[PDB]
């Protein structure tokens, strides 16, 4: 057993942080491997994540995050039984896939409302810019103010981008028909 492609992680910057790796030869991750991790901070405790299978040779871990701030950095250790396979670290804030926006409602004026999925005390609270798609062919609308609304006169879904570097688009929201 050997690591073919070293662990790589992507957090939603609040609660979850998905770490994936590929292996030389097929593994049952659920049984053979165990990935321990510890937030690099005084008097913390390491914790245990039992992985799952992404095909034969590939594994995936949903590490629980106690929220994430920029400063955070975690020590990752991959074990097979009692054999260390791999040593490493990662900052979750450094590879981000934003969570999807929420309850997309409708309303002269045509008002669309949604929920920012992050709470007031979170960094992504006021660092999300929204994209709105509008059947046959469509048209987009880039919302770049803090308010999660849109107005006009005369499928329909919403997504989210974050003011970061190693970022991507959120999944689309549940969609309504105007």
């Amino acid at each position, epitope marked *: 057993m050997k690591v073919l492609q070293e662990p790589t992680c992507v957090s939603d910057y609040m609660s979850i942080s998905t770490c994936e790796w590929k292996m030389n030869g097929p593994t049952n991750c659920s049984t053979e491997l165990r990935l321990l991790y510890q*937030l690099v*901070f*005084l*008097l*913390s*405790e*390491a*914790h245990t994540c039992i992985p799952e299978n992404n095909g034969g040779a590939g594994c995936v871990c949903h590490l*629980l*995050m*106690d*929220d994430v*701030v*920029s*400063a955070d950095n975690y020590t990752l250790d991959l074990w097979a039984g009692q054999q260390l396979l791999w040593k490493g670290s990662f900052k979750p804030s450094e590879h981000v896939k934003p969570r999807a926006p929420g309850n997309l409602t409708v309303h002269d004026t045509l008002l669309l409302t949604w929920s920012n999925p992050y709470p007031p005390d979170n960094y992504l609270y006021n660092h999300l810019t929204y994209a709105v798609n509008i059947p046959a062919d469509f048209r987009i609308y880039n919302v770049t103010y803090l308010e999660p609304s849109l107005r006009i006169a005369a499928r329909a879904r919403v997504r989210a981008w974050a003011q970061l570097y190693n970022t991507t688009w959120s999944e689309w929201s549940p969609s309504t028909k105007w």
Partner: antibody
Amino acid sequence: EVQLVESGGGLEQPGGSLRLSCAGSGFTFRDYAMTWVRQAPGKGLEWVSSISGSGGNTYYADSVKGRFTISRDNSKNTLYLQMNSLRAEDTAVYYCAKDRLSITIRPRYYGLDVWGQGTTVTVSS
Amino acid sequence: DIVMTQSPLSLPVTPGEPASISCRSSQSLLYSIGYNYLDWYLQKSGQSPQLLIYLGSNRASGVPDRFSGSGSGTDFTLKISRVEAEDVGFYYCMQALQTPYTFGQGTKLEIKR
């Protein structure tokens, strides 16, 4: 309430050994990190040792590295400093304290918010 | 290790008057925004130390509204709005970011009556 009670202090010889103890009640001992602080007569506070709530990580002040030993029993709700090969300037009053909640992925620290009554170690001939 | 410099060593005051203790660390004790790791303790001689303030400016349970924390990075201040006869004792600050936990020298608070 929530209390820490210390024991195991007296007069030991230069070169001797002593074991300190910290009974703790009113919470989940295991959930929390613990810390030993010492205060020489006249002089101010001086952090000695610390340990995570699992037993996982230990932390030692330099001047006691290798000599003193931190340990805990989370079933008996007790914490120990295993003082070994003592010198004259180990003479101080020893306190223990409730440090940070460590169970959770991120520690929560609200200061050393609960203190033990103290116990004295004198190192003399 | 982080050097804490506590000032003054001696604080004579008069009951009802305001009082101040400064604390300068040799490095930043902020981890994240809102999270400075600086604490304030009082010790009445004969007694065990007790927390007044954790994480820069949070009051310990037991601590009256009179005691106020303040500061960020490397500059901390403990304010007593009106001193009282039971404020007598020794005041310590402590960084709790890196081991070893280090202590300011200490302030003797003394009432002029």
